[PDB]
Structure formats: structure tokens, C-alpha cells
Amino acid sequence: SVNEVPDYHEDIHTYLREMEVKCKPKVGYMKKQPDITNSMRAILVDWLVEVGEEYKLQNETLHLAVNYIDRFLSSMSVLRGKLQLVGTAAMLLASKFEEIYPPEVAEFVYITDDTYTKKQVLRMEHLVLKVLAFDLAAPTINQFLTQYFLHQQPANCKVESLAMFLGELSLIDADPYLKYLPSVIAAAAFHLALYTVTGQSWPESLVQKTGYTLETLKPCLLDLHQTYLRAPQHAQQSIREKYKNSKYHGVSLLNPPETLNVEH
Amino acid sequence: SMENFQKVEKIGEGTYGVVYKARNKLTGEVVALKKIRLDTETEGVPSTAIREISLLKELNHPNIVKLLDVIHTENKLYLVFEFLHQDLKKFMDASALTGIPLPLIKSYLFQLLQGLAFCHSHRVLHRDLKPQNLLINTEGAIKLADFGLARAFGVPVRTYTHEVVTLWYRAPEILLGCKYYSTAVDIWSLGCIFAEMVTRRALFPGDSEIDQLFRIFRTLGTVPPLDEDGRSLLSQMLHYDPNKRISAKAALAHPFFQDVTKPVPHLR
Numbered sequence: 048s049v050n051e052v053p054d055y056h057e058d059i060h061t062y063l064r065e066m067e068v069k070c071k072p073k074v075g076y077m078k079k080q081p082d083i084t085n086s087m088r089a090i091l092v093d094w095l096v097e098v099g100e101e102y103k104l105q106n107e108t109l110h111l112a113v114n115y116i117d118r119f120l121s122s123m124s125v126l127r128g129k130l131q132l133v134g135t136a137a138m139l140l141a142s143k144f145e146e147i148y149p150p151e152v153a154e155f156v157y158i159t160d161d162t163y164t165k166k167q168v169l170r171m172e173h174l175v176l177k178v179l180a181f182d183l184a185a186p187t188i189n190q191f192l193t194q195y196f197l198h199q200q201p202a203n204c205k206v207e208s209l210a211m212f213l214g215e216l217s218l219i220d221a222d223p224y225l226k227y228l229p230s231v232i233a234a235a236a237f238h239l240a241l242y243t244v245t246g247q248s249w250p251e252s253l254v255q256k257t258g259y260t261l262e263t264l265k266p267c268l269l270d271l272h273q274t275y276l277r278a279p280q281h282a283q284q285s286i287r288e289k290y291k292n293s294k295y296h297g298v299s300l301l302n303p304p305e306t307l308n309v310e311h
Numbered sequence: 312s313m314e315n316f317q318k319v320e321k322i323g324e325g326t327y328g329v330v331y332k333a334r335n336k337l338t339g340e341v342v343a344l345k346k347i348r349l350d351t352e353t354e355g356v357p358s359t360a361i362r363e364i365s366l367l368k369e370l371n372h373p374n375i376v377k378l379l380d381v382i383h384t385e386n387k388l389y390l391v392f393e394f395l396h397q398d399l400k401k402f403m404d405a406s407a408l409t410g411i412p413l414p415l416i417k418s419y420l421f422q423l424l425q426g427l428a429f430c431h432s433h434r435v436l437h438r439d440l441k442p443q444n445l446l447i448n449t450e451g452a453i454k455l456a457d458f459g460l461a462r463a464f465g466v467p468v469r470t471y472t473h474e475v476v477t478l479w480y481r482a483p484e485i486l487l488g489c490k491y492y493s494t495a496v497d498i499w500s501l502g503c504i505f506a507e508m509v510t511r512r513a514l515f516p517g518d519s520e521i522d523q524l525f526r527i528f529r530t531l532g533t534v535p536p537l538d539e540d541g542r543s544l545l546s547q548m549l550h551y552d553p554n555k556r557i558s559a560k561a562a563l564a565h566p567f568f569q570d571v572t573k574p575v576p577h578l579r
């Protein structure tokens with residue numbers, strides 16, 4: 048209907064595809080941050096998921112904050128004891144951008160266990176805005192997924208939730224996921240989720256839309272399959288906890304497919 | 312920071328902040344400054360600012376007001392805009408007795424649709440199209456302004472803020488509180504504005520939400536001086552059903568705009 052925006056979805060898809068390239072953080076930014084690591088980032092991103100659950104925020108909000116963080120850290124050296132302040136400011140900024148009812152600032156100070164002060168959060172907010180030069184309308188894995196869901200015949204709630212879940216898992220591990228674009232991560236996630244539940248493939252309709260085939264999506268699939276397989280053993284666990292709920296149909300409790308199949 | 316700029320007069324107050332006419336003492340350029348106070352002990356940079364700035368930096372079109380610069384301080388945020396000489400509301404009021412020439416009306420609608428189509432092409436709802444937020448110059452251009460209430464939507468849309476467009480320009484799907492609303496709400500608005508350019512008075516000047524609804528039901532069932540073409544487009548811009556309602560992109564291809572030009576507005 049009009050809610051699926053038929054006169055504009057093609058135009059919109061092209062622009063998101065064009066913008067995700069310009070909002071992409073630098074691939075090896077962690078190699079240049081002398082005080083912080085990938086592991087540390089994983090703690091942070093996982094903690095944001097917990098924040099997302101407690102305050103019942105939109106997943107889009109989570110994906111944006113992660114983009115804000117990676118971009119900030121792609122240009123600013125941050126010490127370990129300030130990583131969470133950045134992260135908190137990112138979540139606030141993302142909330143304000145995306146949420147109908149963003150949590151008030153005091154609520155963001157609360158979840159940082161009073162490690163930081165209200166003023167610090169407020170100052171970091173402005174700092175994040177400057178570094179990102181107010182460019183906050185970044186395309187996310189979610190914005191692509193939600194478009195791909197329109198190509199289901201018919202719609203499957205287990206798939207959508209599983210697609211959400213996998214794409215979400217990628218936010219945790221900068222290695223490797225920093226080197227894939229949101230649209231690609233979404234594409235792999237969608238295939239992998241669809242194949243698990245129903246048993247079928249990345250649809251032909253979405254091949255003419257994206258220009259992505261499984262052969263182009265191969266490297267990403269393999270990495271995402273790995274992560275899926277390993278997920279129960281991962282240090283960070285909040286995404287699996289989140290996706291055990293009836294809300295998300297418990298798709299994290301499903302068994303990952305042993306193999307995918309694809310080569311001569 | 313603002314040493315270069317010289318305040319001339321107060322322009323007024325948008326959805327947020329305060330707007331001034333100002334001149335760059337060095338270049339001679341006349342600008343409009345949207346001044347935004349922060350808010351540092353509470354509550355931060357307002358989401359209206361964050362959205363307008365983030366979006367308007369992206370959107371670069373002849374029919375969308377141009378954001379020139381963003382100037383920071385610790386306590387004040389100054390948006391530097393291109394100045395436009397007046398708004399559609401004052402122009403219509405100025406043209407209450409004379410009328411607005413039709414080829415001008417056609418032009419303004421054509422441009423408003425071009426600007427809006429560019430918004431919709433880039434996943435942006437404006438959500439506050441009223442004649443006060445539509446700016447005209449002396450060259451003949453009209454532009455969409457104040458993106459303070461704008462939002463970057465997704466495909467498909469989800470539930471957005473309800474308290475969203477000013478009563479008189481509000482689409483029925485917002486009035487009746489339908490969980491989803493989309494690009495159609497902006498079309499509805501331009502529809503009411505089209506009508507308003509012809510008659511030089513609001514089409515549905517409701518006193519309340521109920522009244523607003525009833526006024527809509529009267530007219531469309533439950534604008535005299537306009538040609539057959541004009542009415543067709545109008546009623547397609549004001550379809551009850553948001554799915555049936557015309558898109559801006561399709562509106563530009565209407566026979567109504569076949570002979571369109573770009574006249575200079577009568578009056579200063």
C-alpha cells in the first residue's frame with residue numbers, strides 16, 4: 048500500500064545504497080586506537096543491547112548508535128575509561144533521532160551506573176555531533192532488512208526475527224563485520240535466516256534489486272554462519288538473551304544449519 | 312564565531328528556536344539565522360535541531376531551503392540559512408483582494424511538488440507543510456522550510472509521532488489515529504495549500520479535531536475558479552484513501568502542469 052511506498056522504494060533503495068558507503072567507518076580503526084580493543088567494543092555494544100531492552104527502544108536505534116560509535120572512534124582517540132561515555136552519548140543521540148519517546152537524559156546517566164556525570168554525557172553529546180558533523184541519518188542493516196522482508200512469499204515471522212537476530216550479532220564483532228556494508232550484512236542475514244526456517248534461498252526478485260548473488264555474498268555468509276554457529280560460546284550474550292522471548296519468537300533457541308551448500 | 316554577522320530584524324519563531332535576518336559584513340550576503348539555545352544542565356541538543364540539521368545537510372534541491380552553515384558554541388547553536396524575502400502565508404494575505412495569477416499558482420505547486428518529491432525520494436517526511444513554512448523569493452522560486460518536525464522514514468514505515476502536522480493541514484489518517492501513516496500526509500497538505508492559493512483562505516479551517524473531520528466529510532462527501540485539469544489533480548491530492556492518493560512523483564506528470572512556466576511574483 049502507501050506504507051510500502053511503491054512510487055519511491057527504488058529511488059530510496061539507491062540512495063541508502065549510495066549513503067551507506069559515505070557513512071561507513073574505516074575498516075581498521077581499532078588498529079589505530081592505542082588504548083581500546085575489539086573485545087572492549089564488544090562489551091560496549093552488548094551493553095547497549097541491554098540498554099535497548101530495559102528502555103524498550105527500537106532496534107534501529109541500536110544500529111544507529113553503533114554506527115555513531117564506529118564513526119566517532121574512526122576519528123577520535125579514546126581512552127578505556129571514556130569508551131562507555133562515548134557509547135552512552137551515541138545511544139542518547141540515536142534515541143533523539145529515532146525514538147518517538149526517547150528516554151530523558153537522566154535515564155542515560157542512570158544506566159552508566161553513575162560512573163559519569165550528567166554534564167559529561169551532555170558535553171560528549173555535543174562532541175559526538177561535531178565529530179559526526181551532525182550527519183546522523185546513516186543507513187543501517189535494519190533499514191535494508193525491512194525492505195528485503197517485503198520479498199517474502201508469503202511473510203514468515205520466524206524468518207524476520209532470525210534475520211534481525213543475525214544482523215544484530217554482527218554489531219558485536221568489528222572483526223570481521225566492519226568490512227561489510229549494512230546492505231550486504233542484511234542480505235547474508237536474510238538468506239541465512241530464510242534457509243534455516245523455511246529452507247529456501249535469497250529470492251531472485253532481490254537479485255535484480257540489490258545486484259547481489261550468493262557468489263557475491265559468499266564471504267559474508269561464511270563469516271555470519273561462523274558467528275551463528277559459535278554464538279552460544281561468545282563472551283557477549285545479551286543478543287541471544289533478547290531473542291529467546293516470545294516477542295522475537297525465540298529464534299535464538301533454534302539450531303543453526305550444519306552447512307549451507309554452494310560449490311562445484 | 313558570529314562576529315561577521317550583523318542582526319537586522321527578527322523574522323519570527325519556527326517549530327524550534329528563533330530566526331533573524333542578518334548580513335555577513337564581509338561578503339554582503341543576507342542570511343537567516345536560526346538561533347537555538349542549549350540546555351546544558353538538562354537535556355541537551357533538541358531532537359528537532361538534530362533532525363533538521365542532519366536531514367537538510369543531505370537534501371540539496373532548488374525547492375528546499377538551503378542550510379549554509381552550522382555554528383557551534385557551548386551554549387548557543389546557530390543555523391545559517393539562505394534568506395528568502397517572504398512566506399506563502401503573507402503572500403496570500405497580501406493577495407487577498409487582487410488574487411494570485413494562475414500561472415504563478417501552477418508554478419508554485421509544480422515547485423512544491425518537485426521539492427516534496429525530492430524529500431520522498433530520500434526517505435524524508437516533512438510533516439509540517441503549511442504556507443508559513445513555504446518560502447518565496449522575487450526571482451520566482453518557492454521552497455520548503457522548517458524541517459524541525461521532519462522524520463527519516465523506513466520502508467515499510469512504522470508507527471511515528473502522532474502529534475504531527477498543524478490541524479488545518481492534517482490528513483484524515485492522522486486525524487483518525489491510524490497506526491501507520493506515510494508520504495500521503497505530505498500530499499494531503501500540498502492539496503490543502505493548492506486550494507488555499509486559489510481562494511486565498513484555508514480549505515479546512517477546523518476549530519477542533521471533530522470539526523476538522525466534519526469539514527473534510529462535507530467537501531469530499533461521506534474551489535470554484537479552477538479549471539477541469541486543476542480540480543482533477545486536487546481531488547487526487549485529497550483522496551481519503553492514502554493508498555489511492557496521488558504521489559508527488561505522479562503529480563508532476565499531471566496534464567495540469569503541461570503548460571507550466573516560472574513567473575515572477577506580482578507584489579514585492
Ligand SMILES: CC[C@H](CO)Nc1nc(NCc2ccccc2)n2ncc(C(C)C)c2n1
Nearest residue numbers: 323324325343392394395396397398456457
Ligand atoms: C520557516 C519558518 C520561519 C519561522 O519564522 N520563517 C522564515 N521566514 C523566512 N523568510 C520570510 C520572512 C518572514 C518574516 C520576515 C521576513 C522574511 N526565512 N528565510 C530564511 C528562513 C530560514 C530560517 C529557513 C526563513 N524562515
